[PDB]
Assembly symmetry: D3
Homo-oligomer: 295 residues x 6
Amino acid sequence: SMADRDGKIWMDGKLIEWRDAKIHVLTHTLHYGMGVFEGVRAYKTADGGTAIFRLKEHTKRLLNSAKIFQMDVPFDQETLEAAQRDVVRENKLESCYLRPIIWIGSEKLGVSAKGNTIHVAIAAWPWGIRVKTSSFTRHHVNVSMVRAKASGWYVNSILANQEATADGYDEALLLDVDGYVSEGSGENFFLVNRGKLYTPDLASCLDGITRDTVITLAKEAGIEVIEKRITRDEVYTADEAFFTGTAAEVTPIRELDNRTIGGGARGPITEKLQSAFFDVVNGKSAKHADWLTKI
Amino acid sequence: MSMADRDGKIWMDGKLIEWRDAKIHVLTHTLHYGMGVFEGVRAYKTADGGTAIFRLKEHTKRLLNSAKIFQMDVPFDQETLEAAQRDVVRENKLESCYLRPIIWIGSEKLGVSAKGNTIHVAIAAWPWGEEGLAKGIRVKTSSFTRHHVNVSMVRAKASGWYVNSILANQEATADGYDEALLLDVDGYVSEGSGENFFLVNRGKLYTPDLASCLDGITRDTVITLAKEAGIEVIEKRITRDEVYTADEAFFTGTAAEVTPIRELDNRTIGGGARGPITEKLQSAFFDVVNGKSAKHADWLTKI
Amino acid sequence: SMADRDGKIWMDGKLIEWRDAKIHVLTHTLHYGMGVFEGVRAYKTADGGTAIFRLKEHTKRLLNSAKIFQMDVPFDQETLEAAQRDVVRENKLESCYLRPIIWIGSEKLGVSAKGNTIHVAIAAWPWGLAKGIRVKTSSFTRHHVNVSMVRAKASGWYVNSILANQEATADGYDEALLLDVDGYVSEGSGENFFLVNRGKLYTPDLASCLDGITRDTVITLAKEAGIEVIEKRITRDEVYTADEAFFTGTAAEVTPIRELDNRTIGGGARGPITEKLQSAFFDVVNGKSAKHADWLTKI
Amino acid sequence: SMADRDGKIWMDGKLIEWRDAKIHVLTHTLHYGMGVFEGVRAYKTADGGTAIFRLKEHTKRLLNSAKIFQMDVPFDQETLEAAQRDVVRENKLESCYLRPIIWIGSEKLGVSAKGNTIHVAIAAWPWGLAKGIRVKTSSFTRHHVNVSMVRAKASGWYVNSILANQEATADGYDEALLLDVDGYVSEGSGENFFLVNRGKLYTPDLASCLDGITRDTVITLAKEAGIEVIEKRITRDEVYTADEAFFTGTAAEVTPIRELDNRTIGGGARGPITEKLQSAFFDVVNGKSAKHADWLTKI
Amino acid sequence: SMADRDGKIWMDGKLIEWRDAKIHVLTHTLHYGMGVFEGVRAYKTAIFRLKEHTKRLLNSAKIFQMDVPFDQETLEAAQRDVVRENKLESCYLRPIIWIGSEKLGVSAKGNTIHVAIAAWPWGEEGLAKGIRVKTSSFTRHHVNVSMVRAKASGWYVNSILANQEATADGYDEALLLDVDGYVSEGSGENFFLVNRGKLYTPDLASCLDGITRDTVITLAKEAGIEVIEKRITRDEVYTADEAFFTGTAAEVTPIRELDNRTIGGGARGPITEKLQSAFFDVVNGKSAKHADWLTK
Amino acid sequence: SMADRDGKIWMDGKLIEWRDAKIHVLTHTLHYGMGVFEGVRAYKTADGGTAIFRLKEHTKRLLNSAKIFQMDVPFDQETLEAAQRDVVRENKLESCYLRPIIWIGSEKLGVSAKGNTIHVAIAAWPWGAYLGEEGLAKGIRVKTSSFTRHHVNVSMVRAKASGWYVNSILANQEATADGYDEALLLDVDGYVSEGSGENFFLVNRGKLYTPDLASCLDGITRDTVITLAKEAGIEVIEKRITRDEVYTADEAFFTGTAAEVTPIRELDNRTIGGGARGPITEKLQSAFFDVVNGKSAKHADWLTK
Ligand SMILES: [Cl-]
Ligand SMILES: [Cl-]
Ligand SMILES: [Cl-]
Ligand SMILES: [Cl-]
Ligand SMILES: [Cl-]
Ligand SMILES: [Cl-]
């Protein structure tokens, strides 16, 4: 169990024993879906030291998700950044994944309840493919607030992922309400064609930090980056395709809907970009030193 | 105080436990990812002094159907869950009350796509708008759009589904209205943030088709009573401006019962008060839930 | 010119000379399109009298159109039903067409002006069907129900109708048919649409189309004759393969459609259900129907 | 009252007295919505003179709007420019707002009227900014681009604006922001919409929104400051999390938005890029810019 | 091979030998998709609803403004003669109308409108136990892009794509949603669901106006079953009492699972069984009532 | 009749007599619409030679269309490039039109037949530019269709497939029935997509605008003109375009293999600009003719002789 572990969790202003990070079943977010979270990675750098990747941007995105929902968080940004470093340090972790989550408490359990506590907890733990286009449609931008990385949004991801894996695929790819490629269930989507890098415009899809990272490295590598509406059959005829996300970083996609992408192998743009990414997270990059925060 | 900090009994994973011991870890799958399902059920103090749950079979069927939509294997069958609900009312010494069964995904693995998590079940209950029911309420059309039927499984009564309802209800209430009315992605009226919507025009009863909206038990109840009153019930696509010109309008829901709407977007609905068909359906609904109907005695389970 | 006539117009409470029914170019409705109107007919009835068809319902729809716009009309329904009759009476008209219109006046220009006078004016003037018309499906799409309030009969909504109708008549067709934003048949540029197939009467559901009073009249008549009426989404190619089709409107009445997009509808002339409904309609407007006498108001 | 004033209106070829600018209530545009207008300003300049801002571009847009609707305007561009200056000059106006309007007359009052006169009239009259306004996202949806011709500045277009604007003001906000049919931000009820993020300027692509002359002025100024301008689909929650946001229009000039849907924008006052572009805009309209002197016409 | 067989095909007004029914590769329909066809069955008790199929055929040509140089009666007799001359009994008839080889522009007019009719002899436990269906990730036709009442060669690419998607992952058939996300139909069948004793089907909207559908609707009504045409969500299927497909090929086929969710008890439902039996009793001439649906 | 002619057609690996290139009526693609084709030109060039224009990209696109449909084409790309060339040479042609087509054969005729032969054929024939010459010089009259262009998750719009053309036939017939030269289709959202066989361009204030590659086809002639435009220093913008943007544009034109670069002088009875071929259109048309006629060192690899 992830519940049954030795360690420390930061909760509501202090470190507590991991197993004591409990709440009641009548917690608003459990019933109604309004809570926000992040996924942040720490890496063991070439130093031998450990640093968190883009800590500032992730924490700002967390507080912005809360802002979208008018959730007043009782901690400033600096407290939350320091808390995340503390969780890595006091758990004696090196390469790990951090999960900050902000949720609405147990005072009142109507839909419309106001006056519930806004809770915050932070835990951490140590830390090409075949893809199938999902029969489930990606979020509508005036139904769901797709810039807020919110607990309720993942039902659609779960459904899509479960569909893909039940039939033996590695991951799902979702189309938007107009039938264009939007994203994977937990990742942003990219395609390579004629030496140029394409990605769905920032419309229905999440505003990813790994996406932002890859986009910037591509421009610095002199690769043209185009944001546009992409049809499923552009993917089938692309030269390369890949996913980006905090968990997996850059994953090449060798097949969609049983149509081989390019030669079926990892492509040279995908490799150059994957390498440039490795250099930046292992702290072998002078240019992007400010993306790594040592614990 | 707080809903967590109470004396009584909650049924959880097969047994009654003390209320305060119904606890989950913060790394619980549903808390992070939104896939969980719940019901809201009412128990009423009936005309004969007793207590009875209203449409327990149908709510418990719907709960299990919601889990089925999500391929959540519930480790308890329907009969067990009906009996557990009656136990929670009994052992908390409740009369008129609200029941809240909830099924969620546990703490074993915390990826999006983790499989082999425990499917947990809990049932809590607690005791249970006089002006609104009599005079009607003021409703505002929301700027947020109701769920798309191939994005969200709108027949499944799911935790994640409610973000949209909170946002719409917060907008209405911030500007001083009683409730929100949401339109679907094509601009037709769908439903309230926790209620189904009806309108009356020239002695006929209209409701949005069972398209983007929840398949509501109170809705089903009111439609059956309407038909038993010889009232034509028509499922159709309804524009916001049909509402503005309707003879009457109202909401239905387990919490909401039958709540008349006297105003939408600052346009008065008919005479500005409870309408005569709304009152008739409201009144027949109250007879059925207070155990004063012989026809619908089978909708009440003594508890 | 419609402006240069003898006779009387009812304006803001009283009968005035026709030519004196004038407003300033800085009238809010002229600039910004928020005004509402109606079309109502009077007929010569079998007994030689003259009577307005469904006066109550037309006036209700007019005050409802205002209500939708939150336009506070300074006259009640009894007053506007009385005034309409007065306009027919004083202009010595028999068979004619009435045009009440309610608009926002001249005190303040600017989109968001509050405090303008809400004016009312009623004018009236003297006023295919056996054969069938040729129709063209428009390349312009009909109103979205959350952009325009389609239950309000509003000045601004008719830009769309003008574009469609001009597109049709420029290429030699009689009228346009408009599809909705989903590609399904909605209505003509100023009339509701019906189709007949295997003895049943179909018509687009009351979604984006106008709630026509002629539409309602003909639905009622159809039901009373034992014809099944079905309101559904209709594709253009159900029209091509239908047995009959027609339009309804106050000015139209029931007009048969013999061709859509150069595909012949049925045998290419007026069909038998259309004929029966037309005949039923004329019995009601000419005062031959005891059942429906309260649809006619004498004077 | 805007009808009851001293001054002169240019109408159908000549200056006439202001109160003589009258039309009949049976005027086609009043009933059916197809007429077009333009909003133009004259500003007092730094040399003490007075000039109209982008007269040539506003007049072209007006004539384009009529073209889109196939309204044959009986005056050429040069005549209409001279006419607008004559209206400013002859009413002894300095800082003012000018409103050329073109509409369809009174000869026939059917929907589909051929051979109505195309009328033209021009009037003019004398004519928050600092750390912003509070905006509410409308429940009404913005125009569909194949139902309404959104490039044509059309009387009927404004009914949607009036509805959104009244909804926002009724609840105590300053203005509405409208989403398009797909849920993306389109524009204000009378202004275009811009957001700033990470030192770049974003605006909804010219899709469902108006082709603004202030919008154009501001985009040009931005690019001349070396600010990157990107047209893209913008979600409402992108605005909640943006560094800055503002509106543009002829009447609004550049108005900062400090709050949308009770979410503070940035720090909740006017932002640095908005202030820069606002200052640049005022430098150009007050004639302090040699570079953009050809945007001003001496009166 | 279907091209290499003993028999007769009726083509452009006369019976020719089967292997003689040939066209050139520069045939307009082959390149541009505008052709129309039918599927008709004959049963051992009779062609089933020959008049109605032949009328739908001529209506499809009409929608496309394809002038067919034969009347309905001629085409009805020809179909009868094609079954006869191949000495067929239980069989499938395929009339096809297409556009010939005169001009290969998109916009070419003055191409010949050809007609050919073939037939050939004609899933028990699928009919008995029910099938496993997968909701497609391809969307069903838009009704102002494709003329969905016309049974048109080009309309079948969407069907093929979907069917292949479903079969590749081991399902029996695909189910397609429309552009709005509602249940439309299978790749060659109409869709029905039963709930609380009542029969539901997507409204005639994006779906094909099926002859088997119509048959089944009429039997249901005669049996006193309420039939409702409405928009249906995919999750309404998952929680339905019963579901099935109708089609000239599919007859009445139960659906026992959709997207790995069991429908009701996982077998053929009682209202499905009753409808399927009414259907087979009609096609095998065991019902006086509907005698005028069979030709002999 | 295109069936009744002297010449050679390449079919399933061989040159045979034109008239022998026959199939049965029971051919899957005739019934079900799954087949794919190209249109490709050859021109007589500056030195008396003749060359096929962008053969590489037309043949890669053909095979990609098969890919999208999962049609296993039994020849690789080289053989098909050479086969197209063979067919121009043997029929002794110069300025001509080539039509390769890949279709599903006659073994099984169920919808989901998954065992047919994948057949391939190439035909070519001559092209007379004078008959379309005045449209090229003076521009054409276009009518917005009441039919909507393909939805990108119903039809695979990057596959140039036999079945997509029903929509094009319908729109074209509607335009030509009422006396217009061509149709313009709007997409499911009301924006300008393309003509029934051509990509659409607009010019305004010196800049070149075209519909984003969304529901419209990824035209080789579209790509050719965008490239030439960028090389001439013209800003190119791919955006959503309303129909009233065309009514007020300074110039407009269609591109396509058949249509080359064809100006549009009127849409929906609204004159485009001065009502004649505009200057930018003329420049880009001349650059296009320069490239196809072998008058450009910059794009010499687009011609195979
Ligand atoms: Cl993550
Ligand atoms: Cl509830
Ligand atoms: Cl009328
Ligand atoms: Cl303005
Ligand atoms: Cl079949
Ligand atoms: Cl071509």
